Amino acid sequence: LVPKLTASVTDGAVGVTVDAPVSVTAADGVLAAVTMVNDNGRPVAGRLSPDGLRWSTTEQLGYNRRYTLNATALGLGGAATRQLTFQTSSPAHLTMPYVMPGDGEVVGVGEPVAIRFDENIADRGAAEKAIKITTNPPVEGAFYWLNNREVRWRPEHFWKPGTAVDVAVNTYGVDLGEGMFGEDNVQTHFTIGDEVIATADDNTKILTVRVNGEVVKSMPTSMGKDSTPTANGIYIVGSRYKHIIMDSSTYGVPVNSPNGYRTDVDWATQISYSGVFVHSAPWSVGAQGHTNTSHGCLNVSPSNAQWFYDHVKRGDIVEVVNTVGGTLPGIDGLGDWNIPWDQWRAGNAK
């Protein structure tokens, strides 16, 4: 028997995707030599298995390249040589993914996986399929798109503390539609910490912090006045600031408009993209626990704001109930939990 050479590509192939390595296998014989070079004769790094049967590229293959593969196999029956030339995908566009939360971080039970591309994704289904989420303990979750560029993944209920989450965004070499391919892969891994849920009840004007079911803090608060009420619903804790200038125009409202503002505040924890913060409000300590006076923020005392800053982490939960407001939009950016599971699970990959 004469040796046979089999590749993971074929001679003359076009549109070969670079999301996977290229390999060669010998039958009835072993691989004596394999080389692969690009257009300019530059070799691609590769590795032959110890038994001589399988060779594979070991470095990233490039877009828009023509590669030439030369392989020789020898057996007791003689020799065989093949030359294969193929071309890889030629993207019209590249998009780079950006993932949250950060690698190595410990986050709260409300924290979604977020993947944000720097370009509109025409094929949402292809993006979803290329994102590999591993959970331990395993739990079911689903993708939901907040806009044309950012997709979210979460389970049905808040994470169980101590859960490992691994996010492999394997977009390199993947056609995301209309000739748009991933610029690169990105990876992140994070862990779920303590269950921290702070409930603001407008009926009592108390913000209660519960850590793993236990009441550890009770904060008198002043929320949005009737004309600018705090929306009810579930909020995810985002970033924390020792101090920050809260500029209303960041959130769509002109500073000079009647509901506009620009205020320097201390110990500020953001809980919506719409501009809701828990923060130090020295000017309303008298109203806190009693009447709503703010633009929608949860006013608390200086010491309580700093407490909150010190004890609350990204992905922890603030729930607001019984205000005269509506419900925080599910696609706020930090309002993902306000979308019912059936709707979330169904997705909008369209």
Parse the chain into domains and list their residue ranges. Answer: 1-89, 90-193+336-350, 194-335
Q: Two tokens at 50?
A: 């110890």
Beta bridge partners of 151: 115, 145
Answer yes or no: 311 catalytic.
Answer: no
Q: Two tokens at 6?
A: 């089999």
Local structure of 342: helix, strand or coil: helix
Give the residue ranges of the annotated binding site. Answer: 175, 178-179, 261, 274-275, 299
Give the residue ranges of the annotated binding site for substrate. Answer: 261, 274-275, 299
Q: Two tokens at 188?
A: 């992140």
The Cα 302–Cα 281 span in angstroms is 6
> What is 90-193+336-350's CATH topology?
Immunoglobulin-like (2.60.40)
Written as one letter, the residue type at 238 is G
Q: In the sheet where 141-145 sits, what is the strand order?
A: 97-100, 113-117, 150-155, 141-145
Out of 93, 157, 243, 297, pick the active-site residue: 297
Q: Two tokens at 108?
A: 């709260």
The Cα 23–Cα 56 span in angstroms is 4
Tell me the chain's radius of gyration from C-alpha atoms: 27
Local structure of 2: helix, strand or coil: coil
Give the residue ranges of the annotated binding site for Ca(2+). Answer: 175, 178-179
Answer yes or no: 290 catalytic.
Answer: no
Out of 93, 189, 279, 295, pick the active-site residue: 279
Q: Domain 194-335 carries which CATH code?
A: 2.40.440.10
Q: Two tokens at 53?
A: 């049967």
